[PDB]
Enzyme design. Structure first.
Site, short mmCIF file in Angstrom:
data_model
loop_
_atom_site.label_atom_id
_atom_site.label_comp_id
_atom_site.label_asym_id
_atom_site.label_seq_id
_atom_site.Cartn_x
_atom_site.Cartn_y
_atom_site.Cartn_z
N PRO C 1 20.12 -8.27 -1.33
CA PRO C 1 21.60 -8.38 -1.34
C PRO C 1 22.17 -8.60 0.06
O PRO C 1 21.52 -8.25 1.05
CB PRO C 1 22.10 -7.03 -1.85
CG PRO C 1 20.98 -6.48 -2.65
CD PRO C 1 19.74 -7.04 -1.99
N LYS C 32 17.88 -2.40 -5.60
CA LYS C 32 17.01 -3.36 -4.89
C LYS C 32 16.43 -2.64 -3.70
O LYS C 32 17.01 -1.71 -3.18
CB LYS C 32 17.80 -4.56 -4.37
CG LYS C 32 18.69 -5.24 -5.37
CD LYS C 32 18.11 -6.49 -5.89
CE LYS C 32 19.08 -7.16 -6.84
NZ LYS C 32 18.90 -8.62 -6.89
N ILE C 64 21.67 -11.80 -6.38
CA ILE C 64 21.23 -12.35 -7.67
C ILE C 64 21.25 -11.26 -8.75
O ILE C 64 20.73 -10.18 -8.57
CB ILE C 64 19.83 -12.98 -7.52
CG1 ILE C 64 19.78 -14.07 -6.44
CG2 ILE C 64 19.36 -13.57 -8.84
CD1 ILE C 64 18.41 -14.57 -6.11
#
Lengths: 117, 117, 117
Positions: C1, C32, C64
């Protein structure tokens, strides 16, 4: 609305109060209240615009609903160019604008998103 | 095209003239004239890249037509990494690029938008 | 990110190590790994938020898959507001967040794009 302005003018050549005057200007141009206008000015950067390092400025405008068509953005552009050329003492060749539509699910406010407010 | 480069290298460690050399480099890589290349460099920032505060750089590239597919952006990425690793003296692990397609109605130029020029 | 934070707090009022602590915080919030978190902090800017030049901060989050729905971003927003209000000593009225989904073909890494990795 969100306005972000990058410029290679040093901080001490950007007129005092510009971020406040750009809130009032955006309010009239975009038809949103001044208390919903967010402005970010980043001076003192290294920039080339159209291949030239002469003084310049880049503006980014993001909002829900009002910056999503050529016809709306043509009007917006004319009014922002009039404001910025006079405030920054730049020619129209030294300013570019980018317009970005947003949706309510993309805006985080008071610990939620705008979809739920 | 619009190129924006954020880095945690202090301004006095970014090579003089980088913004001009990045215009020439982008012209050859993207196939657009150097006089249509816009570069913004923002040095001296606080950054972590891959969780590490070692020197790093983030590049954002925005353009009409040419940054919209994996195959085009793979080529672009290889050439930008070669340019930036050598100019900034960074390893390839310390640079990331983001690509953003634009449309003509999003670009304000000379008081209008590009749709009408 | 990718996290980008603009603030009008001077650099010497932003707590040391913020960019590292925001990597750990984002890792837990977004699910993440911290070694895939990229943070950019740009202090010392001229800003108005909701028409007011009092201390404020704007956060942009791009990733994403995980920032693409109202329900996901409501959760994300609540956790980021808790982190940032405490770190920056700001009220919740002085922070806004924007969320931007990315696709693999937009991310240049190690001289290619993520589509091919």
């Amino acid at each position: 609305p969100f306005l972000e302005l990058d410029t290679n003018l040093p901080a001490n050549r950007v007129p005092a109060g510009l971020e406040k005057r750009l809130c009032a200007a955006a309010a009239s141009i975009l038809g949103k209240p001044a208390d919903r206008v967010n402005v970010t000015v980043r001076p003192g950067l290294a920039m080339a615009l159209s291949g030239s390092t002469e003084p310049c400025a880049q503006l980014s405008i993001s909002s829900i609903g009002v910056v999503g068509t050529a016809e709306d953005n043509r009007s917006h552009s004319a009014h922002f160019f009039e404001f910025l050329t006079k405030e920054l003492a730049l020619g129209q060749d030294r300013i570019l604008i980018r317009f970005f539509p947003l949706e309510s699910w993309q805006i985080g406010k008071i610990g939620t998103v705008m979809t739920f407010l």
